[PDB]
Amino acid sequence: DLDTDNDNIPDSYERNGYTIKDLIAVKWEDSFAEQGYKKYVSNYLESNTAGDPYTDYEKASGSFDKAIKTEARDPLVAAYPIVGVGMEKLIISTNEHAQGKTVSRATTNSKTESNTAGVSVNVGYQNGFTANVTTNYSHTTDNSTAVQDSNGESWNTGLSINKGESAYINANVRYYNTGTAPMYKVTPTTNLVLDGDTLSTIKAQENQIGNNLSPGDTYPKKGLSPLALNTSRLIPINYDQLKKLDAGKQIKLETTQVSGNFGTKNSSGQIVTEGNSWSDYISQIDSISASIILDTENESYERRVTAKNLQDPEDKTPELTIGEAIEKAFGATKKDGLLYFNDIPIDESCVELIFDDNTANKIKDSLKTLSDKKIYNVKLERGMNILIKTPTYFTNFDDYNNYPSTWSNVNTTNQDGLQGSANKLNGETKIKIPMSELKPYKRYVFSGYSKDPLTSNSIIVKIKAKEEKTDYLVPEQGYTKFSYEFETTEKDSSNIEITLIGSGTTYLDNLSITELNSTPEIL
Amino acid sequence: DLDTDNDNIPDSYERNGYTIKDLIAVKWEDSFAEQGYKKYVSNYLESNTAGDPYTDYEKASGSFDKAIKTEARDPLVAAYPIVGVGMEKLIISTNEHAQGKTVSRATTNSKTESNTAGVSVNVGYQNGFTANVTTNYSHTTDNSTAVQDSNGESWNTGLSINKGESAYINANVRYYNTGTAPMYKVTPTTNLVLDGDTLSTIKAQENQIGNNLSPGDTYPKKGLSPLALNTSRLIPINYDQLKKLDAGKQIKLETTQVSGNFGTKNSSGQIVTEGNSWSDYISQIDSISASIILDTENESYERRVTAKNLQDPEDKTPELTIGEAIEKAFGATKKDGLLYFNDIPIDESCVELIFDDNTANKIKDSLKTLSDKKIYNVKLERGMNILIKTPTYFTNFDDYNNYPSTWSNVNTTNQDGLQGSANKLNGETKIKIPMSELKPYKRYVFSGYSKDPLTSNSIIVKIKAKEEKTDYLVPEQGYTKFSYEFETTEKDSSNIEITLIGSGTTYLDNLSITELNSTPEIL
Ligand SMILES: [Ca+2]
Ligand SMILES: [Ca+2]
Ligand SMILES: [Ca+2]
Ligand SMILES: [Ca+2]
Ligand SMILES: [Ca+2]
Ligand SMILES: [Ca+2]
């Protein structure tokens, strides 16, 4: 009844109970939990509960732009777009006009690679820290170009460059937007960076863009030929970066400064998008929220949900856990003690968690006062960076098992597992996961949980590949998370062997395989 | 109960008790110091207690731009942005369009290098003056560039310049803000000066910037590529500076004028930044305040905090000492007798304090009337220039010990120290601090306090480097601040030794190692 801000949601409703139905506001009482309505909590001191240019009434009543993702309807979640550029095919011709020697390679853009390339894992995890620390944290703007169609052949051989000259470079690209907001007068600047050697800056203008870029699409819309770099001329190169690129290094591509407007609905008619900008509010959004990246094996999200300053009782903003933030940011189906995506079982024991040094130190500090020792029951403070990686394959010996192949001696008939049941061991356990399904010249992590209600009954693992290893593991009365690395190579090799030899007492649960980054092939 | 300004805070509350909670003002009764609420004090003759475009109500209540630092929520702390230019990579090419003979070198920018370059250090500090006098005081507008990748090789050999001609010069720059205020319509002028020969006046324009620069942010936001000078043409140089830059002089780069606006909350919607300027309150803030620079090893701050004219009985403005200004300007945690930043124990005996002639002589004058002989218990004066430099390493035989190398014959089981405990001396005292963790070819100072409850018992010290030195130090009943200079060299040398022989009576405390400025090299 009592109103604070210029939003129709009152002080008693801005916090502690939050529902909008048929363009009026009602409290939350768990009577319409599965009837398409969710509970929120907003700041009661700002109608713009997030850093958004929207009142929390404007953003949660449907009274806003329909191109905005409904994940931004939560008042704590801010509408925030991120545009990057995917790399498709690299063509190298020795002319400045556009004949001559020319090579062409198929390039794949990896977005979340540099964030996760400098990650090195131990065999075991100390304390309740069930995650690892990245060396550096990078957002979803940068892209790393991997050459796939690269047999043993030097790049110099296809161009025949002797002493000082070089060719010219041309590229195939995609212009993706990954955020909870739409984007209109897109003007991105972009650096073509080879380990700091920026070959050129290309700005995408507006003509080769079109005056709309909705979230979740490239400029070449889905299945289409990628846009070449001639529509605004050729990029030069010199013979220092050729053997640099040839041997181990890859070309990188980074969007530097992306400029444009947003749209606001007018009084009478259709939208107007002229007198706005996603430049005057970027820092306002980026300062109040933490930064959370979700990364499946085929797409990614990145969200900014407003958090709390702990050293500020004057700051009266809602406080949520990690899991509450993930549910109200990305959208999650709440099963009993579990969060789900549309299909992926997401948990602190089902995916891979990555934090930079500040976030890792903060959660290491916070885990100690927890009486439960879990990652997700930690309140969010303003301004941390969190990354979530879905593993490539995952089973929990439960409803979810998307494996390429099954094991040997699977005794899942159990109930003292982490999620219900668990897989018993009696003898060996075998998987022969093929060469062609896996991506060449990459790095992969096999992780699992082993529990043993015995004193010193132990297991041995063996990962047989081109870089094979044999390791010894001791489980105990508690559950043990273990991780072991291996490297992929090109597809003309044999299959991939993983063998586990136990002693019939150790129990295995929640086995996952994830990708980390690509090892550079020698060329 | 009496209102004087247009500030809702009354006459009885604009002085002697000052708290904003939930956009109302209450007196200070120290029932609420430890819940994140700081005590302040404002004018009652002017609405804007500082020279900022904010009243004391506007700036201390959250009723202002959220991009402004909360250290500027203190009404005595003025919103004052200082934008400097980081220098990253120096590339020399002999062409005009952008082939030819090129070199590329790694350069590092120091903000406070010229301010602390004229610092001459006494081994024995007279009076309570436990500090030094710099010859010159410079703000955070200038930068000095040191070239790192320097083997023995002249610049002229790599370009082969005989008589009159020369190449052109190209640069990598970043554009940081160091102040308690934001920045929008960035129009800076920056001179590229080589010992008086300004090689260019580079203007950043606005397109290569974007219309925002937050406090504490470069133009390439954190991890990116630095902005280059081809997006606005090449810069020339001539063959009088080629040997000059080669032999002794390094290029400096300083901002002269920066133009641009700030942002105000409108009546209806969002912030507006057209009808503002960071060129009119610059003189209002720079002239009413002292100029206080803080220099960590990894960033720098520069604040202008309003001071008092002591020759003015009608002027009723708040008055603070050095420490009160530091706390209210930077944000500090108060331990028992200690000011803390995030981790650094800051004091008048834990860091280096630097004053130009005006501030240093006024401090020496103020030292006589004080009965405590400490530096921080001096009232601030208008238009004073105070610089604080942290030591690179600092230990006090206490909770704070960040020395990577460790000492010998350390008996910290004592309590007659300056800060609690002290280290007893028996025989030799050794430290082998290696070449890897010290910055090559730069001037460093080993400083400490020696106290001796005996008549003439003394020590000998020895700082062994490429120049080794032995000194004789006599301590007495009081605490003695002593300092010894030394120079680092290239990493192909041996370790750095600091040794001292005592006589079993001398006591040592508060040992620090700081750095003053870089030295030119033979080339
Ligand atoms: Ca309200
Ligand atoms: Ca609100
Ligand atoms: Ca299970
Ligand atoms: Ca007033
Ligand atoms: Ca006032
Ligand atoms: Ca001490």
Alpha-carbon distance of B302 to B292, in angstroms, equals 6
Tokens of B518: 């870089």
Torsion of CA A30, A32, A38, A39, to 10 degrees: -30
Neighbours of B16 (CB within 10 A): 10
Where helices occur in A29-91 by DSSP H, the ranges are 56-60
Q: What 3-state class would DSSP assign to A13?
A: helix
CA distances (Å), B486 to each of B76, B112, B150, B462, B495, in order?
Answer: 40, 20, 21, 10, 13
Contact residues, chain B, for A287 at CB < 8 Å: 66-67
The residue type of B440 is P
CA angle B250, B256, B261 (to 5 degrees): 135
**A313 neighbors A367 (Cβ within 8 angstroms):** no
Q: Is residue A513 within 8 Å of residue A352, measured between CB atoms?
A: no
Residue given tokens 């909008």 in the structure block: A20
Residues linked to residue B362 through DSSP beta bridges, in sequence order: none
DSSP states of B401-427: B--SS--SS-B-----BTTB--EE--S
Q: Are B69 and B81 in contact (CB under 8 A)?
A: no
Sort strands A442-451 and A428-433 into parallel, antiparallel or unpaired.
Answer: unpaired
Which run of H or E residues covers position B469? strand B469-473
Angstrom distances, CA of residue B177 to CA of B72, B83, B255, B281:
15, 4, 12, 17
What letter would DSSP give residue A213?
B
Judging by beta carbons within 10 Å of its beta carbon (0-12, 13-18, 19+), is residue A120 exposed, middle or buried?
Answer: exposed
Interface contact flag, A311 B36, Cβ < 8 Å: yes
Look at residue B287 and give its three-state secondary structure: helix
Q: Strand A187-194 relative to strand A197-203: parallel, antiparallel, unpaired?
A: antiparallel
Cα(A26) to centroid of ligand 1, in Å? Answer: 13
CA B155 to chain CA centroid, nearest Å: 32
Beta bridge partners of B481: B449
8 A C-beta contact, residue B421 and residue B412: yes
Interior CA angle at B514 toward B511 and B515, to 5°?
Answer: 160
List the structure tokens of A169: 């470079």
Say how far apart CA A445 and CA A498 lie, in whole Å.
Answer: 12
User: With contact defined as beta carbons under 8 Å apart, do A412 and A396 qualify?
Assistant: no
Angle, alpha carbons A188-B95-B151 (nearest 5°): 95
Give, as one character, the DSSP assignment of residue B64. S
Q: State the DSSP code for A225.
A: P
The reply to whether A282 sits in an annotated binding site is no
Task: Tell me the ligand closest to B396's alpha carbon.
Answer: 6
Phi first, then psi: what are they for A362, rounded to 5°?
Answer: -65, -40
H or E, element range at A459? strand A459-464
Nearest to B37 among A201, A287, A314 (CB): A314
- Residue A435's CB is within 10 A of a number of other CB atoms, namely 16
- Helix, strand or coil for residue B59? helix
Tally of residues, chain A: 523
How large is the C-alpha radius of gyration of chain B? 26
CB-count burial class (<10 Å; 0-12, 13-18, 19+) for A125: middle
Between the CA of A327 and the centroid of ligand 2 the distance, in Å, is 20
Phi-psi region of B220 (alpha: psi -120 to 50; beta: other; left: phi over 0): beta
Given a contact cutoff of 8 angstroms between Cβ atoms, the answer to whether B265 and B182 are in contact is no
In A296-384, where do the E strands start and end?
300-306, 333-335, 338-340, 345-346, 352-355
Asked if residues B99 and A164 have their Cβ atoms less than 8 Å apart, the reply is yes
CB contact under 8 A, B99 and A238: yes
Q: What are the backbone angles phi and psi of residue B240, rounded to the nearest 5°?
A: -130, -25
Residue A310 corresponds to which tokens in the numbers above? 């702990």
* Residue from A57, A77, A83, A136 nearest A289 by CA: A77
Enumerate residues 6+ apart whose C-beta is below 8 A from A58: A7, A47, A64
Question: Among A272, A314, A315, A385, which would you mutate to test the B interface (most chain B Cβ atoms within 10 Å of its Cβ)?
Answer: A314
Q: Does A54 touch chain B (CB under 8 A)?
A: no
Going from the Cα of A1 to the center of ligand 1, the distance in angstroms, rounded, reads 9
Chain-centroid distance, C-alpha B478:
30
- Is A492 annotated in a binding site? The answer is no
**Closest by CA position to A203, among listed B208, B217, B174, B206:** B208
How many beta carbons lie within 10 A of that of residue A172, not counting itself?
Answer: 19
Report yes or no: A77 and A329 within 8 Å, Cβ to Cβ: yes
Assess B94–A contact: CB distance below 8 Å, yes or no: no
Q: Name the method of structure determination.
A: cryo-EM
Amino acid at B145: T
Q: Given phi > 0 = left and psi -120 to 50 = alpha, else beta, which region is B100?
A: left
| Alpha carbons B229 and B185: distance in angstroms, whole number | 19
> Could you please report the per-residue DSSP string of B337-359?
TEEE-SS-EE-TTTSEEEE-HHH
B71: three-class secondary structure by DSSP = helix
Q: Locate all alpha helices (DSSP H) within B352-501, ordered by sequence.
A: 357-369
A469: alpha, beta or left? (left if phi > 0; alpha if psi -120 to 50): beta
Q: In this structure, is the dihedral angle defined by the CA atoms of residues A266, A271, A273 and A278, taken in order, positive or negative?
A: positive
Dist. CA B459–CA B451, nearest whole Å: 11
Name every chain B residue with its beta carbon within 8 A of the beta carbon of A238.
99
Let me know: does A18 contact A42? Beta carbons within 8 Å. yes
d(CA B218, CA B176): 4
Question: What is the rounded distance in angstroms from the CA atom of residue B361 to the CA atom of residue A13?
Answer: 61
User: Could you tell me the sign of the dihedral formed by the alpha carbons of A236, A241, A247, A253, in that order?
Assistant: negative
CB of A462 closer than 8 Å to CB of A497: yes
- Of A305, A282, A278, the residue nearest A292 (C-alpha): A305
DSSP count for chain A of H helices, then E strands: 6, 30
The secondary element (H helix, E strand) that includes residue A367 is helix A357-369
Alpha helices in A137-292 (DSSP H): 241-247, 282-288
Q: Which chain B residues are within 8 Å of A198, Cβ to Cβ?
A: 225, 228
Task: Quickly tell me which residue has 């190209």 as its tokens.
Answer: B170
Q: Find tokens 């580079």 and name the residue.
A: B202
Identity at A318, one-letter amino acid code: P
* Contact between residue B433 and residue B495 where contact means Cβ atoms under 8 Å apart: yes
First to last CA, chain B: 72
The bridge status of strand A423-424 relative to strand A480-487 is: unpaired
Separation of CA B26 and ligand 4 centre (Å): 13
H-helix segments, A36-129: 56-60
Beta carbons of A321 and A378 less than 8 angstroms apart:
yes
| List of chain A residues whose C-beta atoms are within 8 Å of the C-beta of residue B231 | 201
Distance CA A450, CA A483 (A): 11
Q: Pick from A430, A303, A439, A310: which is nearest to A382 by CA?
A: A310
Question: DSSP labels for A137-157?
Answer: ---SSEEEEEESS--S--TTT
Q: Distance between CA atoms of A353 and A365, rounded to whole angstroms?
A: 17
Q: Which helix (H) or strand (E) holds B69?
A: none
The position carrying tokens 């051989």 is A157
Q: Which two tokens stand for residue A271?
A: 């939208």
Q: Nearest by CB to B211, from A236, A279, A312: name it.
A: A279
CA distance A239 to chain B (A): 11
Burial per residue of B37-64, b for 16 or more beta-carbon CB atoms within 10 angstroms, e otherwise = bbebbbbbebbbbbbbbbbbbbbbbbeb
Q: Is A314's CB within 8 Å of B210's CB?
A: no
User: What phi and psi, each to the nearest 5 degrees, are found at residue A142?
Assistant: -70, 155
Q: What whole-number distance in Å separates Cα of residue A146 and Cα of residue A251? A: 8
User: Is B372 annotated as belonging to a binding site?
Assistant: no
Integer Cα distance of A12 and A2 in angstroms:
7
Pick the residue of A54, A143, A241, A257 with the most B CBs within 10 A to test the interface with B by mutation: A257
Alpha helix (H) ranges present in A237-356?
241-247, 282-288, 322-330
Task: Give the pairing of strands A442-451 and A507-518.
Answer: antiparallel
Got the DSSP string for B227-286?
A: EETT----EE--TTHHHHHHHT---EEEEEEEE----EE-SSSSEE-SS--TTTHHHHHH
DSSP, collapsed to helix, strand or coil, labels residue B320 as: coil
Phi, psi angle pair for A388, to nearest 5°? -120, 130
What φ, ψ does residue A476 adopt, rounded to 5°? -145, -165
Nearby residues of A359 by Cβ (< 8 Å), 6 or more positions away: A384, A385, A386
